[PDB]
Amino acid sequence: GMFAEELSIERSRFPRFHSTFTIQTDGSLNEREFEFAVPPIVTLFHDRLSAHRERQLELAKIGKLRKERNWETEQKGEESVSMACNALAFPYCIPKNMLKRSRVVDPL
Amino acid sequence: VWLGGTAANTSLGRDVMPSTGKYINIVSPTDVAANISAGAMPPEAN
Amino acid sequence: NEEKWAQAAMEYLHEKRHCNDSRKRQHDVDNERRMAFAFDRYCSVNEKIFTERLSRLSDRMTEALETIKQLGMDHALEEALMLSSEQPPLNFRRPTLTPPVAGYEPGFGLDVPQLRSRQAEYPPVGRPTDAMEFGEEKDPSFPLVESFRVEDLTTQCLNELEERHGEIREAAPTTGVEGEAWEAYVALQKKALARQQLIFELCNNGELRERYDSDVAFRQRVWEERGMLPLEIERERLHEEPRHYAQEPAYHPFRKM
Amino acid sequence: EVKQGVLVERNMHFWDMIYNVIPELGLSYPGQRFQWVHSQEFFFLKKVVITDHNMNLLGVTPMRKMLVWGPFSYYEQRLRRLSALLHPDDPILALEDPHPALEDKLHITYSHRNCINAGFLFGNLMGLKAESRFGVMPNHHVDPVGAIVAPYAALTTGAVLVHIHSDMFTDDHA
Amino acid sequence: MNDIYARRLAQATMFHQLMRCHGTLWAATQVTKEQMDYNFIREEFMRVNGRRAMPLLLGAAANENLHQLHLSHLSEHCAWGESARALAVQRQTPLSQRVAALGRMAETIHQVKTASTVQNLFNEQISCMEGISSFEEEPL
Amino acid sequence: QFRKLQDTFWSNRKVLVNRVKSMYNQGARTSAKDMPIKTINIKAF
Amino acid sequence: NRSLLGYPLRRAAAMEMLYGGICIQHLAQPPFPLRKIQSESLPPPSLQGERDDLE
Amino acid sequence: QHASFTPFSIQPWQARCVGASRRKLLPQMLMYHGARLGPRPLIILDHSTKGEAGVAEAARKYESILSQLSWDYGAVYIPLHAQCTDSSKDLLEQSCQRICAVMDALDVRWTHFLTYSYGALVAVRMASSQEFPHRVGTLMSLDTPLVTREFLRNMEQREDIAKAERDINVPEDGLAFAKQALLSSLEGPLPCPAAEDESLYRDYLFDPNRIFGAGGLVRDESRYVPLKSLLGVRHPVQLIVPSANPLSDAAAHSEVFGHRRPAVVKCCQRHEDLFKESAAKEVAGVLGAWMRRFEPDCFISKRYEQAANEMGQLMLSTA
Amino acid sequence: GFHSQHRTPVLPQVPAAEVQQAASESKVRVAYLLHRQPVVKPTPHPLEMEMAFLLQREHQRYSRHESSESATHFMAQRGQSIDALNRTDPRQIQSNFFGLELYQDAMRVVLQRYKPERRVTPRDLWDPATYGSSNANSNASSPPTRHSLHRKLDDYLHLIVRDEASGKWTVPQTELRGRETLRMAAERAIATDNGEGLDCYVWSNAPQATVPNANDGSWLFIYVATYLSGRPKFSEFRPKTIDHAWVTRHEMMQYEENFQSPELVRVLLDISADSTFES
Amino acid sequence: DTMFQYPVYENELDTPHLFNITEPPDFFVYWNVSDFERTSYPPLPEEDHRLLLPLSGSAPWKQHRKRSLKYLRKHEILPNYLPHVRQDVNLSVVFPGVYATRARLCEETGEPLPPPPPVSRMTHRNFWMTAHCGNYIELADLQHP
């Protein structure tokens, strides 16, 4: 916490970093760094959009690719609860007189 | 235990150095003054 | 032979607090000072622009919400005021150093199925709202839970957080920039929890609510008692502060030659 | 030092030397000015006074400099309180003996009495008159010519000591 | 020269996240009669994004849950996943975590040595950065 | 000093997990709070 | 006025917080503030102080 | 493959990206050397401009070098006006808002600069001044000195003589002798490698009757840029040196701007031999080698190549 | 670093059975401004490059473990192995990182075959000549066709279309029917008008912006969403599109003359994304 | 650095740094022979007070007044030799000092140096040569009225 003439960076925390060129499954390449010894040019399988194409392939089996329409879903489901909150924002909850609704689910 | 403090530095005629930083992890002369294992040094010792 | 592996591992864990480098000299320390200041002078524009632009956006969305408030649809409000909880999808793509290339499948059609296995994440996450659903006496509608079960979560969160805070503030004091960072973080958390049980307090009692609203002074003193206070960020420094001769560092001057 | 069998002046970096002997001054953490012992090797070493002429008009800042001027007290100057406890035969000087009498005797040591009387005996034996001018050849401040006899002669008998050029060994400054 | 990119991309993401949070925040400021303005928003984002990982050997640190909440997951920019050292700030270094579990005696030496393998730490890291992982929808 | 101090560690933790194993075979269910090591989860042993 | 932590937080930590875990911004720290001493708050000059200061 | 400078003007649909206030400050005439402008060009600044008569000719000077160097983003010349009688502070700020306006209308941030002349000063004034660092990516001067050694030392002496003038302890001998030591050597202006800007230097910028009042002691650099501000710029700055007697000692530039060895053209002897196409090949060699340091494509390609050859060495050392 | 939806639920919306009168009478129109993410990270400043050098040197010299070059080297020195094949020497570890031979060959193949994608598009190379010749000949000039989505990968590219009746540049719009919410409104706007040929990520719930119209006595709600993938076919657009445009935050100001409202420009500017924030 | 700091007062009117003497903290002390002719008087204060009109409503005069009184108590003038001090007039008694370290003579003669011109107006060069509360002045420059 004391005044130093050197610039103050958080020191003696980050062990060391070796940067590595990494080729994502879409052919674009990034550079990310690690603690141990990493070879240059690591070709990456199992990336984000690869996982996306896999999930699309798995929504192809059930044929769920099409769409999910909230607007032309006409569900009359209405439940008025007296005191209820949105737990999905915990640090800011509010006690609203609310309308109960189910979550949208997609098993996979 | 890091042994340090501003008591190593001479101060003449009044001590204007901050008093919290005098002895750091070292026993002061006030600590050995209150802790002496002998007792009652004789009136001839003045 | 396993325990000694563990010993080396622990060795790797422990961080040591170490001195300034003896190869450093005066001129280069000073020119890295210089470099730093140049760079901050450069980020001034960026971050002030970013700042006021964020401001403008919040203004626009504020006058939009008050627009639909004024037009008189009270439904539209409350379904637009609830947070959209669906994250960006898997085809949402992080901007990458280079563009994607033409017709590249992984390894150019060379497949190693070992590498495409999907694995666990550590540590396994859990959140204070997990007790509220996956534990005993779950609620029928989880994101929709009634007030008091949120209040218990609040009052327990304050206690255990403060507890942990005191604990690690004892165990590992931290100062300077990252110390201040940790402290600011914890302070902000406490502030959030405080304001939570404040809005609960203001919702279940309408009397304290209208007395709260009726004036100004009551609001801010009430904030003071409950721990909600502005966070002061000291002003941006573009230049070097003129130093008194006493303002030197507590170590031996960097060696010139 | 010797270039092509010819004595020439070199400028030695003594600074480098001090940092060789005590490398710990290079390692700086921002409590270290005040740590109690500066080198765990020599624990008795406290200040190193650097004497070099810097010709810039602005002095050094008051924390790298010692205060040499004005009254140092209020009630009595403590040097003359202290001088009551000092005795003329208390040794103050040490000089290297190029040809040690024994293996043991390295530096031979002088007292107030020794110095003052050496200089007075030299001063008297020659003859010296107030402000008559009397010179000394350099690099003798390490042996009892420039260290003892000369300046105490100049002090005891009113005289004026004069230094010639700072050094000797090269023809040019001869 | 990662972090330089990472704060630019954080500036990019952040207001996009403001767009979704503004509903909740503006809802809140009406009850509390607080002031809704930049100064509120930025200390809002600070508590979400900046979360320091502590020594992890403490055990009081590794227990801390307040950063894992639902809003705090949604409003957070992804900047941590672009730069390795930012990740190492918010969580800690992937190896340092798993050995810290061995330190606080929350794991067997063997179980740690098993997964501590370089190959693993690589894949866990890229998966974590990319937003791919495993959930056990039922915790314990 | 340092060496024997850091060896005493591995000695005593193996002694501790040993005595914990011998406390778990007698059927005694020990919570995490009363243990000195409190972050310890015995099910991992 | 007051802050929740009671002192103005230094910009490094702030920027390091709202860009999560990253400090490339102000790393050049301003020197600490001065504490002035009142020279007339000091006690009157004493003789024994002068005898024994040298130790 | 010699190719001239096509005169060009900014069209009104592009002029809207510049704020309504400074829309008056972007010029009537411009130029492009190549076929394409790109995200960022090489922006070439030059000496004072009176009419477009001298512009067409001042173009030719760089025409050879720019033709020799193929820059995918080509180049742009922005003329700079001599002066204005109305405001005394108008100059480097006029040129400031001018360059920035043109860059805004061309949709260009982050640009490499070039100058042989007064314009160099302007470019420094960007990087030095707050709130236009972001615009100027890289500054390159040909022979143009931003600083000389005597400005440095005399500025030192001025600061110290100020401090000492305030500081009582300093004897009158040291102070008086220091004041005589400062007056005995006074700063002449920066050497001017431009025909038309000698009037500008001797009159506007560095005239002794203004820049220092209490003459030789207090120097107001407020008209150009102070030494501290200069002393701070870490914008990469390349200086070009003819292999024989030059202007702009690189001593002072390696002191101020950072430690880097100035590009030295072998073919030339002095300047004015820089614009002769004998040396344009080496000049463009340097210019191009320097541009490609900051171009993401080029250095990403490069470092990927390093990593590639590296892994190649690992694969051949495998067997 | 993106989070994966973990156990986190997502709540749909409710088309209230009560039909809103103010939705049918006073026109409430929902417009969606569609943008694509930047394909690449911002091209840095040379200042940034130099300070990156600096920070790398400093972290490198103050790193948690000094002498040792890595975790691998570190554990190796003490005669211990992190690797799965329990190899000590780091170089042979990074020679074949995973112990799989198939991956070795994959690496050889990529080594010879792969070349990094050069990043600038021939799209955005801009020529003043033919353009100033068309603007000199016709005496009037409008910005070039932005129809390309591949144009510059550095920034956020937005969408701007022009009405066939208005002859003016505008956001894609849809009028709001009675029961449904604004989120749903934008949703069906993008969906129906692109005819289920678009994956469209909608960021928020509440609309971003609002603009008044006295002539129409109506309020437009502008709404922000991110384009992922699809074929944005503009023939299907009901409010009569002549031309579309893919437009950075910068040149939305270029269109102000052929834009329908002066307010809509400033507002669209304030809601517009940017990859930089230097403007 | 609250616990380690070199002492700094806001008013050296007592010239405290001459009497209360703290060791130079620095491990390397730079001492020439050239500084024996340097004169160590305290750095010039802001807001030179000798020019202050002693109006009973003025803030700076009040604060300087009470400073001077506290000094007069700490040197035991005020209660002791001068039991009642009504401080109204702002007094400055100045001496025509050259800042000369010791007593000097003439090189051309060997005469005592000629009496200096009586000081007309107060300058910054003249400041430490005055009589403030308790400060120190060399005997050599007190030699004349």
DSSP assignment of J118-135 equals: PP-S--STTSTTB--SS-
Instruction: For chain D, count helices (H), then strands (E).
Output: 4, 7
CA–centroid distance for D60 within its chain: 22
Reply yes or no: is the peptide bond before residue I212 cis, omega within 30 of 0.
no
Chain H positions touching A21 (Cβ under 8 A) are 303-304, 307
Contact G21 E10 (CB under 8 A): no
The shortest C-alpha distance from A34 to chain D (Å) reads 29
Give the count of Cβ contacts less than 8 A between chain C and J: 12
Determine the 3-state secondary structure of F13 from DSSP. helix
Quick one: DSSP state of residue I223? E
The beta strand positions in chain D, using DSSP E, are 2-3, 6-7, 48-50, 91-96, 107-111, 133-136, 160-163
The shortest C-alpha distance from G33 to chain C (Å) reads 8
The shortest C-alpha distance from C68 to chain A (Å) reads 18
C91 touches chain I (CB under 8 A): yes
The shortest C-alpha distance from E138 to chain C (Å) reads 7
List subunits contacting chain B, requiring 3 or more Cβ pairs under 8 Å. Answer: D, G, J
Please name every residue paired with D35 in a beta bridge, in sequence order, or none if there are none.
B4
In whole angstroms, what is the distance from residue E116 CA to residue C115 CA?
17
Quick one: DSSP state of residue J94? B
Question: Other CB atoms closer than 10 Å to residue D125's CB: what's the count?
Answer: 9
In whole angstroms, what is the distance from residue H274 CA to residue H276 CA?
6
Chain E nearest-CA residue for C90: E131
Maximal CA-CA distance, chain G:
61
Residue with tokens 């218990």: C152
* Radius of gyration, alpha carbons of chain B: 14
In whole angstroms, what is the distance from residue H277 CA to residue H266 CA?
13
The closest alpha carbon to H235, from H156, H146, H174, H299, belongs to: H146
Contact D134, D161 (CB under 8 A): yes
Q: Is H175 exposed, middle or buried (0-12, 13-18, 19+ CB in 10 A)?
A: middle
Touching status, chains E and D (3+ beta-carbon pairs under 8 Å): no
Chain H positions touching I45 (Cβ under 8 A) are 110, 134, 137
Chain G positions touching B17 (Cβ under 8 A) are none
Instruction: For chain J, count helices (H), then strands (E).
Output: 2, 3
Chain C positions touching I277 (Cβ under 8 A) are 46, 49-50, 53
Chain G nearest-CA residue for D75: G47
In whole angstroms, what is the distance from residue E2 CA to residue A21 CA?
12
State the Cα angle at H124 between H122 and H129, rounded to 5°: 95
Contact A2, D28 (CB under 8 A): no
Helices C2-13 and E94-103: crossing angle, nearest 10°? 120
Chain G positions touching J11 (Cβ under 8 A) are 39
Give the count of Cβ contacts less than 8 A between chain E and F: 17
Tokens of I110: 């990529």
Determine the 3-state secondary structure of J109 from DSSP. coil
For an interface test with C, which of J6, J9, J12, J29 has the most C Cβ atoms less than 10 Å from its Cβ? J6
Residue with tokens 């490609």: H292
Give residues 105 to 164 of C whose Cβ lies within 8 Å of G. Answer: none
What are the DSSP calls for C13-27, one per residue? H--------TT--HH
* Secondary structure string (H, E, C) spanning chain H: CCCCCEEECCCCCCHHHCCCCHHHCCCCCEEECCCCCCCCCEEEEEEEECCCHHHHHHHHHHHHHHHHCCCCCCEEEEEEECCCCCCCCHHHHHHHHHHHHHHHHCCCCCEEEEECCHHHHHHHHHHHCCCCCCCEEEEEECCCCCCCHHHHHHHHHHHHHHHHHHCCCCCHHHHHHHHHHHHHCCCCCCCCCCCCCHHHHHHHHCCHHHHEECCCCEECCCCCCCHHHHHCCCCCEEEEEECCCCCCCHHHHHHHCCCCCCEEECCCCCCCCCCCCCCHHHHHHHHHHHHCCCCHHHHHHHHHHHHHHHHHHHHHHHC
Give residues 92 to 121 of H whose Cβ lies within 8 Å of I. Answer: 107, 109-110
Tokens of C57: 């956006």
Sheet holding A29-34, edge to edge: A29-34, A18-23, A42-43
Which CA distances in Å does C136 have to A83, B22, E140, I177?
A: 22, 59, 12, 44
| Number of alpha carbons in the 13 Å side-chain half-sphere of residue C88 | 27
Q: Which of G3, G28, G32 sits opposite C33 (nearest CB)?
A: G28
In whole angstroms, what is the distance from residue H66 CA to residue H31 CA?
13
Determine the 3-state secondary structure of D134 from DSSP. strand
Report the first-to-last Cα separation within chain B, whole angstroms. Answer: 36
C213-229 b/e (C-beta count within 10 Å ≥ 16 → b): eeeeeebeebbeeeebb
Contact H175, H164 (CB under 8 A): yes
CA–centroid distance for C31 within its chain: 32
The H-assigned helical ranges of J1-145 are 16-19, 59-74
Q: Is C231 exposed, middle or buried (0-12, 13-18, 19+ CB in 10 A)?
A: buried
Q: At residue D48, what are phi and psi to the nearest 5 degrees?
A: -115, 115
One-letter amino acid of I143: P
I9 touches chain C (CB under 8 A): yes
Q: At residue D49, what are phi and psi to the nearest 5 degrees?
A: -85, 120
C128 touches chain A (CB under 8 A): yes
Quick one: DSSP state of residue D5? T
The shortest C-alpha distance from J81 to chain D (Å) reads 18
J125 touches chain H (CB under 8 A): yes
Determine the 3-state secondary structure of E13 from DSSP. helix
Determined by which method? cryo-EM
Helices E38-49 and E3-32: crossing angle, nearest 10°? 120
Which CA distances in Å does I121 have to H110, H171, I152, I154?
A: 18, 69, 6, 10
